C-alpha cells in the first residue's frame, strides 16, 4: 500500500497473508474454512496466516493453517486478467472471535464515489521497494466506469472496477494482490492489477466481487 497508514493490530480481522516460505499475496476470510484471493496468486503449497499484524514477529493472535484446496475460476484469463478470483479452503477451520473474523459478501454492486478500505503488506513505495512489517490501510473511492476505461483503454472488463486517485500518491502495490477492498461493510473488490503503483492517471484495478457471489456460494457448497 502506497500513501496509506498503519491499520492498528487486528483492526482488519478478515485480512490474511498467503505464505510459501515468504509473504506473496493477501486474501479475505469469508467463513471459518474459506478465503477469497486473486487467481494470479495461485500456487501449490500455500499456508494461510490469519490474525497477523507484524508478519515477521510471532505476537499472539496468529493461526497458521495449510490450504487444502486452492480453486482458480475456470474462466480466469492470465493475459487479460479477467475473472481474477480464487477460493482457498483451509485444512481445518479457523477459530473466530474479534481479532479473526469473516467479512460479508455483497448483496448488490457498489456505486461510484463510495469510500472503501483497501489493505495489505505490499510495497509502500511508488518508486523502488520497501516492504512493511505491519498491516497498512488506505481509504479510496470507487471511480466511475468511464474514468476507469479512459485510464486503461481496451483493458477494463465488466468484472473489473477502478478505485483510488488520479492525482497519484495513493494506491495498492506489489504484495497486496488478492487482498480486500471493503465498502459499506461488504467485500466488493480483490486487489488485482495496475500500471505501476500510485502513478498519476493510473488508478488501481480490482476484481468486481459482486459478479461472483453465486459462483462463490456454489463452489463452497460442492467442496
Amino acid at each position: 500500500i502506497v500513501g496509506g497508514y498503519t491499520c492498528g493490530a487486528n483492526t482488519v480481522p478478515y485480512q490474511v497473508s498467503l505464505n510459501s516460505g515468504y509473504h506473496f499475496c493477501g486474501g479475505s476470510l469469508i467463513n471459518s474454512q474459506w478465503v477469497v484471493s486473486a487467481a494470479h496468486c495461485y500456487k501449490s503449497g500455500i499456508q494461510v496466516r490469519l490474525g497477523e499484524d507484524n508478519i515477521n514477529v510471532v505476537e499472539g493472535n496468529e493461526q497458521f493453517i495449510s490450504a487444502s484446496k486452492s480453486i482458480v475460476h475456470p474462466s480466469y484469463n492470465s493475459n487479460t486478467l479477467n475473472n481474477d478470483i480464487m477460493l482457498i479452503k483451509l485444512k481445518s477451520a479457523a477459530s473466530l472471535n474479534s481479532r479473526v473474523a469473516s467479512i460479508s459478501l455483497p448483496t448488490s454492486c457498489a456505486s461510484a464515489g463510495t469510500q472503501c478500505l483497501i489493505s495489505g503488506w505490499g510495497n509502500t513505495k511508488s518508486s523502488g521497494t520497501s516492504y512493511p512489517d505491519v498491516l497498512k490501510c488506505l481509504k479510496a473511492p470507487i471511480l466511475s466506469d468511464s474514468s476507469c476505461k479512459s485510464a486503461y483503454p481496451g483493458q477494463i472488463t465488466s468484472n473489473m472496477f477502478c478505485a483510488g486517485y488520479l492525482e497519484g500518491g495513493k494506491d495498492s502495490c506489489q504484495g497486496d494482490s488478492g487482498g480486500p477492498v471493503v465498502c459499506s461493510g461488504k467485500l466488493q473488490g480483490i486487489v488485482s492489477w495496475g500500471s505501476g503503483c500510485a502513478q498519476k492517471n493510473k488508478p488501481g484495478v480490482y476484481t468486481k466481487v459482486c459478479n461472483y457471489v453465486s459462483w462463490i456460494k456454489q463452489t463452497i457448497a460442492s467442496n
Binding site: 515468504y22 506473496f24 494470479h40 505490499g122 506489489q174 492489477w193 495496475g194 500500471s195 505501476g196
Partner: peptide, 14 residues
Amino acid sequence: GRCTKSIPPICFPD
C-alpha cells in the same frame, strides 16, 4: 507496463 500486484509481479509489454 501493466503488472499484477503479487510478489513477484506478473507483467506485460504495455
